[PDB]
């Protein structure tokens, strides 16, 4: 309830809108994080949109989505603290960086676990970048939360639509990058990037990965959203087994 009930261990990152801090609850020593949002220049209405959003997020309870726990208002002042689950495994961006540095591609089994658990998280969301996807202590996957929009789908750069299938395209880019350690479409300019995305061509993921995994990732990257598989069709794939799901 009160910021004074927690000790800040350290800053994890200073992403958009403020900081991400690893904190500890004094009462029982529970490790959490909170996000710092400067309500400073908001409106009596802007604050209302924020409150609606925070209520919505308080609604969600899914093992593959970072869990909301509490909100805290400061009086010294102008700061809203959104208290959330801490994911001890870090983010996928760091996994990819490590694979690069070690010259070591990621296990297919790990990619299949990310595919399964992120697809389930999206399914729940339906009633995305590596730095927004976290791992817990068992390498379970948790969806959380100027730059090149590497994952922008074709229809959304033609302003056509933003639907479930656009999410599927983004998941395709993420899994592709997990496999290749590079996004499917790269470019120095955003116009060049747009051309590459529109063309829809990319290299096969490395040959150490199964044809079946390549096939599903490629299908998610289809130029036509109606040729991309739904979450249900993804989860029906024979590649996806019990042990790829979350386990406490
Ligand atoms: C602000 C992000 C955040 N981070 C975590 N866990 C976490 C992230 C990054 C590392 S790292 N780069 O040092 O290996 C370790 C742990 N958990 C969060 N839950 C909500 N927001 C979170
Ligand atoms: Cl490599
Ligand atoms: Cl290749
Ligand atoms: Na770590």
UniProtKB/Swiss-Prot annotation:
Modification Phosphoserine occurs at: 153, 210
Tissue expression notes: Isoform 1 and isoform 2 are expressed in peripheral blood T-cells and a wide variety of transformed cell types. Isoform 1 and isoform 4 are expressed in the testis. Up-regulated in various cancer cell lines, as well as primary breast tumors.
Binding-site residues, ATP: 12-20, 35
Activity regulation summary: Isoform 1 is inhibited by ionizing radiation in the presence of PPP1CA. Its catalytic activity is inhibited by the inhibitor CCT241950. In the presence of this inhibitor, displays an autoinhibited conformation: Tyr-68 side chain points into the active site, interacts with the activation loop, and blocks the alphaC helix.
Outcome (variant: residue 210 to D): Loss of kinase activity
GO MF terms, alphabetically ordered: ATP binding; metal ion binding; protein kinase activity; protein phosphatase binding; protein serine kinase activity; protein serine/threonine kinase activity
Cofactor: Mg(2+)
Annotated ranges, domain Protein kinase: 6-240
Subunit structure: Isoform 1, isoform 2 and isoform 4 form homo- and heterodimers. Interacts with NECAB3 and HMGA2. Isoform 1 interacts with CDC20, CTNB1, MAD1L1, MAPK, NEK11, NPM1, NDC80, PCNT and SGO1. Isoform 1 interacts with STK3/MST2 (via SARAH domain) and SAV1 (via SARAH domain). Isoform 1 and isoform 2 interact with MAD2L1. Isoform 1 and isoform 4 interact with PPP1CA and PPP1CC. Interacts with CEP68; the interaction leads to phosphorylation of CEP68. Interacts with CNTLN; the interaction leads to phosphorylation of CNTLN. Isoform 1 interacts with CEP85.
Function: Protein kinase which is involved in the control of centrosome separation and bipolar spindle formation in mitotic cells and chromatin condensation in meiotic cells. Regulates centrosome separation (essential for the formation of bipolar spindles and high-fidelity chromosome separation) by phosphorylating centrosomal proteins such as CROCC, CEP250 and NINL, resulting in their displacement from the centrosomes. Regulates kinetochore microtubule attachment stability in mitosis via phosphorylation of NDC80.
Name the UniProt record assigns to this protein: Serine/threonine-protein kinase Nek2
Species for this entry: Homo sapiens
Range within the parent protein: 3 to 271 of 445
């Amino acid at each position: 309830s009160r910021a004074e009930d927690y000790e800040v261990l350290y800053t994890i990152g200073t992403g958009s809108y403020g900081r991400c801090q690893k904190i500890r609850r004094k009462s029982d020593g529970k490790i959490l994080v909170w996000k710092e949002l400067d309500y400073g220049s908001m409106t009596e209405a802007e604050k209302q949109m924020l409150v609606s959003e925070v209520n919505l997020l308080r609604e969600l309870k899914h093992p593959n989505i970072v869990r909301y726990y509490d909100r805290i208002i400061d009086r010294t002042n102008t700061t809203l603290y959104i208290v959330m689950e801490y994911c001890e495994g870090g983010d996928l961006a760091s996994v990819i960086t490590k694979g690069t540095k070690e010259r070591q591609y990621l296990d297919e089994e790990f990619v299949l676990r990310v595919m399964t658990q992120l697809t389930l998280a999206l399914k729940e969301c339906h009633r995305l970048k590596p730095a927004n996807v976290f791992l817990d202590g068992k390498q379970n996957v948790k969806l959380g939360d100027v730059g090149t929009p590497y994952y922008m789908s074709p229809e959304q750069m033609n302003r056509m639509s933003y639907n479930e299938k656009s999410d599927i395209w983004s998941l395709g880019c993420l899994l592709y990058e997990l496999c290749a350690l590079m996004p499917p479409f790269t470019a120095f300019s955003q116009k060049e990037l747009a051309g590459k995305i529109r063309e829809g061509k990319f290299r096969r993921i490395p040959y150490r990965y199964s044809d079946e995994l390549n096939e599903i990732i490629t299908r998610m990257l289809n130029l036509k959203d109606y040729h991309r598989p739904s979450v249900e069709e993804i989860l029906e794939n024979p590649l996806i087994l019990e042990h790829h799901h979350h386990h406490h």
